[PDB]
Design a binder for this molecule. Structure first.
Ligand SMILES: *[C@@H]1O[C@H](CO)[C@@H](O[C@@H]2O[C@H](CO)[C@@H](O[C@@H]3O[C@H](CO[C@H]4O[C@H](CO)[C@@H](O)[C@H](O[C@H]5O[C@H](CO)[C@@H](O)[C@H](O)[C@@H]5O[C@H]5O[C@H](CO)[C@@H](O)[C@H](O)[C@@H]5O)[C@@H]4O)[C@@H](O)[C@H](O[C@H]4O[C@H](CO)[C@@H](O)[C@H](O)[C@@H]4O[C@H]4O[C@H](CO)[C@@H](O)[C@H](O)[C@@H]4O)[C@@H]3O)[C@H](O)[C@H]2NC(C)=O)[C@H](O)[C@H]1NC(C)=O
Ligand SMILES: Nc1ncc(-c2ccc(C(F)(F)F)cc2)nc1Br
Ligand SMILES: [Br-]
Ligand SMILES: [Ca+2]
Ligand SMILES: [Cl-]
Ligand SMILES: [K+]
Ligand code: NA
Ligand SMILES: [Zn+2]
Length: 802
C-alpha cells in the first residue's frame, strides 16, 4: 500500500528514498508502482523535445519544457545539452581535437573529480572496431582515453551476475546472484527477472560501490533506472545532480542502457537492424559530453564506458533436449538456455540419483552440444560451485546452442537470434572497457583484464578503501595516471628447514625397491647443497603464507618444498632449456622408488600403500624423462618426488611431461615449470587444512589431491632464453582435476595427441587462482615492479583465436 496522494513538487529524482506508505519520487519508483500521482507530470516532462533550435534561444523560461534554452538555464543546470552549440556558437565535444588532461580542471568547491559509470547491456567487444563508423563519440573516448581490446565477464555471462560483479568485485558464487533465475533451499524462495522477490535484500551479498561510498562519506547518485525513464532524461538528471551545492552533490553516478542487448536478442549480434541501437548509444554519449562541456566539467570528471557481456548467434533449431537422453525427464527441474542447472523436481523422491543422470548425459551423441558436470568438477577458472544456490549438476553448453528439457518448452514460449551466458572465455561473450579523464592515462592501450578487477579501481578513483573482494588490488595500476595503490608482498608465515643426510637406508621399511670417485662426489654434494638452484629457481622460492612444517630439497635438475604434514611437495621447480633432450625411463628402473636419506621414514610415503590400493597408482612431479644425465635420473625416483595418481590421470600427466613440456621449451626458448598438488574437497577455491581431506591412499596417511597445477614461465621477448631474460615475463598455467576416469574427454580412447592438450586448455588458470588454492605466493624475487608482477599473476591464457 502506497498513499500515492502525497506530491513530487520539488522532489523530482530525490537522492534519499522515502519509506512506505508515503509516496516515492526516486528514479526507481515506477518499478515498485509507488510514484506520487504527479510524478509523470513534474519529473518526466517531454514538452518541445530534447534539443534547442535557433528560435528557442534566450526564450522566456517555461517550466513545462523537457529542457531549457533560456539565459538562466546554465546556473539552474537544466539547459538542453546542445544549448551552447545552437545559441552561443560553441562546438560539439566530438569535434574538438583531444588534449591531454594532466590534472583535474574542476569548478571551485569540488573536493575530488567525480566518477560517471556509463554501463551498456550486451555491448560485445568487437563492436568497437566493427561499429566504429557510426560511433564517433565513443571512438573519441576510446582513442583519447585508456582502453582494453576487450574485458572478460564472469560466468555465467548473464546480466545480473555481471552487473553485480562490476558493483562489488566478487565472483557470483560469493555475491550470491549466481544466475538470472535462482532457487535458494535455505529460504525456500525463488528469484526471477519478472517480479517482486528480486527486490528483497537477502539475495544480494558483498558490499556494492554505492554502499562503500556512503559508509566512507562519499555521496552517491542512485545507480538504478526504471526501464520507462527515457535515456535523455537519465542524462539530464545526472547533469542536474552535478549542479547541486557542494554539500549535497554526489561524487559517483551511473547511467545504464538496455541497448544493445535488447535488439541483439531479436536480431543476432550483427543483424543489420543492429546499426541503429549503436547510433542511438553514441548519441547518448554525445549528449553527456556536450552537457559536461557546458558545465565546464568535461576535463574534470572521470568517465568509465563498460559493458556487462557480449552476444552470440543462437536460434531455436540449435536446441538439445534432455528428453532425447533421459527416460525420467519429469522427475527433474532444469534451469535452461545457454547453461543448464539440474535438480530433483521433488526432495521427497528418494529414487533420484545425480550419478545416473550424469552417466545418461555423457558422450551419448557424436557431436553432443553440451557437457554435464558435478559442479566441483567444473574448470576452477569459472569459480562456480561454492553457493547453495548453484545446483550439484551443471551443463556447460557449446557456444551458439541452447539446452531445454522437452521440445514443448521451446515452441510454447521462432523468436530469438542472439543469446549470452556461455563460458566466460568465449570470444563472442567478451565486452568493453574505456576509461577517460584526469585520473586515467592518455592515448593508452592496456591488455585485456577481468571485470572482477574494476571495483578496486573505482575505489581508487574515489579515494575509498575497498571492501574485501576477488580483485588483486594493484594489478590495474597501469591504467592510472595517479591514485595508484602500492601494495606490499605478503610476509612469509612459515620458514623452511634445510635437512642434510640424517638417515640410513635400512631405517626405511616402505616396501619400495630399486635396482641401483672424488671428482664426481664433491660434485653431487654441492648439487644437494643447492649449487644449480639459480638455474631451477628463477624467481625465488615461493613463500608459504600459512603455518606448517616443510623442507627445501635440492637436486641437480630440480628443487622442491617438501611438506611433512601432507607427505609430498607443495611445489617442485625446474628449468628446461630449448636444447634439452627427452630420454626414456630405463628398464632396470621401471618400478624404482628410492628412500630419501634427508627425510625421516615417518615423514615418507610408502610403496606398500600403493600396492594395496587397487584404484590408486603414483606419478612424479619432476619428470624422469627430462633428467639431464643418467646419474641425475636417480634423483627423480626419490620417494619425496612421488605423488598419488589414478591410472586414468597418469595418461594425462605422462603426455604433458613426456611430450608437451619439451614442445613449449622449443616454442618459447626454454621454460621454467613449477608443478604441485591442490586439495580443495569443499570446492571453495581455497587451500584445505588437513582436517578437510576426504580421501587417503588405502591404509595410509597419504592424502589424495583433487587437482594438479603447473605454472610455465618464459621471456616475453622469446629471442632471450628463459634463464637469461632481461625484461617482462610470459606465463601460462593450468589446474587439471585429478579424476579416476576420463569421462570429461569424449575422445579419450584415442591417442593422447588427440585429447590431452584440449583438456588442458579447458583447465587453463591464472597464477592467482593457484595462490588461493595452495596458500603460496610466487615470483618473490624478480627485477620487475610489483604491480607488473600482479598483472602477470592475473593473466589468463584463453586459447581463443584473435
Ligand atoms: C572472493 O572474495 C570473498 C570476499 O573476501 C571471499 O569470501 C570470504 O571468504 C571467507 C572465508 O570463507 C569468509 O569468512 C567467513 O565469514 C563468516 C562470517 O560471514 C559473514 O560476514 C561477512 C562480512 O560482513 C559477509 O560478507 C558474509 O556474507 C556471506 O553470507 C551470506 C549468506 O549467509 C551472503 O549474503 C553473502 O553473499 C556471503 O555468502 C558467501 O560466503 C559464505 C561464507 O561466509 C558462503 O558459505 C556462501 O556460499 C557464499 O559463497 C557473512 O554474512 C565467519 O562465520 C567464518 O568463520 C568460520 O570459519 C573460521 C575459519 O577461519 C573459524 O575461525 C570460525 O570459527 C568460523 O567457523 C565456525 O563456523 C563454521 C561454519 O558455520 C563451523 O563449521 C565451525 O565449526 C565454527 O563454528 C569465516 O571467517 C567471508 O565471509 C567471505 N566473504 C564473502 C563476501 O563471501 C572469497 O573467499 C574469495 N574467493 C576466492 C576464490 O578467493
Ligand atoms: N536498470 C538498471 N539500472 C542500473 C544498473 C546498474 C548496475 C550496475 C552498475 C555498476 F556498474 F556500477 F555496478 C551501474 C548501473 N542496472 C540496471 Br538492470
Ligand atoms: Br545490480
Ligand atoms: Ca578448500
Ligand atoms: Cl541463469
Ligand atoms: K595401486
Ligand atoms: Na572418455
Ligand atoms: Zn540479454
Amino acid at each position: 500500500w502506497t498513499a500515492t496522494s502525497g506530491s513530487c513538487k520539488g522532489r523530482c529524482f530525490e537522492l534519499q528514498e522515502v519509506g512506505p506508505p508515503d509516496c516515492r519520487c526516486d528514479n526507481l519508483c515506477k518499478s515498485y508502482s509507488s510514484c506520487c500521482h504527479d510524478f509523470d507530470e513534474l519529473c518526466l516532462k517531454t514538452a518541445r523535445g530534447w534539443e534547442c533550435t535557433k528560435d528557442r534561444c534566450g526564450e522566456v523560461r517555461n517550466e513545462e519544457n523537457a529542457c531549457h534554452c533560456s539565459e538562466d538555464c546554465l546556473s539552474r543546470g537544466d539547459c538542453c545539452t546542445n544549448y551552447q552549440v545552437v545559441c552561443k556558437g560553441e562546438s560539439h565535444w566530438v569535434d574538438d581535437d583531444c588534449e591531454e588532461i594532466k590534472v583535474p580542471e574542476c569548478p571551485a568547491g569540488f573536493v575530488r573529480p567525480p566518477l560517471i559509470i556509463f554501463s551498456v547491456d550486451g555491448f560485445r567487444a568487437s563492436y568497437m572496431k566493427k561499429g566504429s563508423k557510426v560511433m564517433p563519440n565513443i571512438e573519441k573516448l576510446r582513442s583519447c582515453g585508456t582502453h582494453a581490446p576487450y574485458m572478460r565477464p564472469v560466468y555465467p555471462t548473464k546480466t545480473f551476475p555481471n552487473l553485480y560483479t562490476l558493483a562489488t568485485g566478487l565472483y557470483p558464487e560469493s555475491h550470491g546472484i549466481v544466475g538470472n533465475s535462482m532457487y535458494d533451499p535455505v529460504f525456500d524462495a525463488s528469484f526471477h527477472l519478472r517480479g517482486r522477490e528480486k527486490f528483497n535484500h537477502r539475495w544480494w551479498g558483498g558490499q556494492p560501490l554505492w554502499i562503500t561510498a556512503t559508509k566512507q562519506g562519499v555521496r552517491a547518485g542512485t545507480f538504478f533506472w526504471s526501464v520507462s525513464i527515457p535515456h535523455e532524461r537519465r542524462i539530464l538528471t545526472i547533469l542536474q545532480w552535478l549542479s547541486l551545492p557542494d554539500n549535497e552533490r554526489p561524487s559517483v553516478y551511473a547511467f545504464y542502457s538496455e541497448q544493445p542487448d535488447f535488439s541483439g536478442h531479436k536480431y543476432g549480434p550483427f543483424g543489420p537492424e543492429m546499426t541503429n541501437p549503436l547510433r542511438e548509444i553514441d548519441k547518448t554519449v554525445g549528449q553527456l559530453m556536450d552537457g559536461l562541456k557546458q558545465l565546464r566539467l568535461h576535463r574534470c570528471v572521470n568517465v568509465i564506458f563498460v559493458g556487462d557481456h557480449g552476444m552470440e548467434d543462437v536460434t531455436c533449431d540449435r536446441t538439445e533436449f534432455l528428453s532425447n537422453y533421459l527416460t525420467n525427464v519429469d522427475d527433474i527441474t532444469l534451469v535452461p538456455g545457454t547453461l543448464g542447472r539440474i535438480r530433483a523436481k521433488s526432495i521427497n523422491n528418494s529414487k533420484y540419483d545425480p550419478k545416473t543422470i550424469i552417466a545418461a548425459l555423457t558422450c551419448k551423441k557424436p557431436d553432443q552440444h553440451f557437457k554435464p558436470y558435478m559442479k566441483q568438477h567444473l574448470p576452477k577458472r569459472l569459480h562456480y560451485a561454492n553457493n547453495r544456490r548453484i545446483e550439484d549438476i551443471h551443463l556447460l553448453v557449446d557456444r551458439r546452442w541452447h539446452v531445454a528439457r522437452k521440445p514443448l518448452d521451446v515452441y510454447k514460449k521462432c523468436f530469438f537470434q542472439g543469446d549470452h551466458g556461455f563460458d566466460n572465455k568465449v570470444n563472442s561473450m567478451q565486452t568493453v572497457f574505456v576509461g577517460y579523464g584526469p585520473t586515467f592515462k592518455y592515448r593508452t592501450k592496456v591488455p585485456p583484464f577481468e571485470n572482477i578487477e574494476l571495483y578496486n579501481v573505482m575505489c581508487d578513483l574515489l579515494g575509498l578503501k575497498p571492501a574485501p573482494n576477488n580483485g588483486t588490488h594493484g594489478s590495474l595500476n597501469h591504467l592510472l595516471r595517479t591514485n595508484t595503490f602500492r601494495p606490499t608482498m605478503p610476509d612469509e608465515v612459515s620458514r623452511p628447514n634445510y635437512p642434510g643426510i640424517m638417515y640410513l637406508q635400512s631405517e626405511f621399511d616402505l616396501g619400495c625397491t630399486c635396482d641401483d670417485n672424488k671428482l664426481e662426489e664433491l660434485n653431487k654434494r654441492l648439487h644437494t647443497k643447492g649449487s644449480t638452484k639459480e638455474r631451477h629457481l628463477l624467481y625465488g622460492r615461493p613463500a608459504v603464507l600459512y603455518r606448517t612444517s616443510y623442507d627445501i630439497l635440492y637436486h641437480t635438475d630440480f628443487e622442491s618444498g617438501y611438506s611433512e604434514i601432507f607427505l609430498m611437495p607443495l611445489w617442485t621447480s625446474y628449468t628446461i632449456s630449448k636444447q634439452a633432450e627427452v630420454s626414456s625411463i630405463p628398464e632396470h628402473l621401471t618400478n624404482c622408488v628410492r628412500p630419501d636419506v634427508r627425510v625421516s621414514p615417518g615423514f615418507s610415503q610408502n610403496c606398500l600403500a600403493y600396492k594395496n590400493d587397487k584404484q590408486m597408482s603414483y606419478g612424479f612431479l619432476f619428470p624422469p624423462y627430462l633428467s639431464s644425465s643418467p646419474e641425475a635420473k636417480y634423483d627423480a625416483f626419490l620417494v619425496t618426488n612421488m605423488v598419488p595418481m589414478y591410472p586414468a590421470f597418469k595418461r594425462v600427466w605422462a603426455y604433458f611431461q613426456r611430450v608437451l613440456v619439451k614442445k613449449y621449451a622449443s616454442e618459447r626458448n626454454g621454460v621454467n615449470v613449477i608443478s604441485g598438488p591442490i586439495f580443495d574437497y569443499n570446492y571453495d577455491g581455497l587451500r584445505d587444512t588437513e582436517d578437510e581431506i576426504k580421501q587417503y591412499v588405502e591404509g595410509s596417511s597419504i592424502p589424495v589431491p583433487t587437482h594438479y597445477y603447473s605454472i610455465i614461465t618464459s621471456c616475453l621477448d622469446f629471442t632471450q632464453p628463459a634463464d637469461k631474460c632481461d625484461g617482462p615475463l610470459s606465463v601460462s598455467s593450468f589446474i587439471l582435476p585429478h579424476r579416476p576416469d576420463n569421462d570429461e574427454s569424449c575422445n579419450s580412447s584415442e591417442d593422447e595427441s588427440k585429447w590431452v592438450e584440449e583438456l588442458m586448455k579447458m583447465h587453463t588458470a591464472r597464477v592467482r587462482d593457484i595462490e588461493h588454492l595452495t596458500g603460496l605466493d610466487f615470483y618473490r624475487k624478480t627485477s620487475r615492479s610489483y604491480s607488473e608482477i600482479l598483472t602477470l599473476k592475473t593473466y589468463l591464457h584463453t586459447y581463443e583465436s584473435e
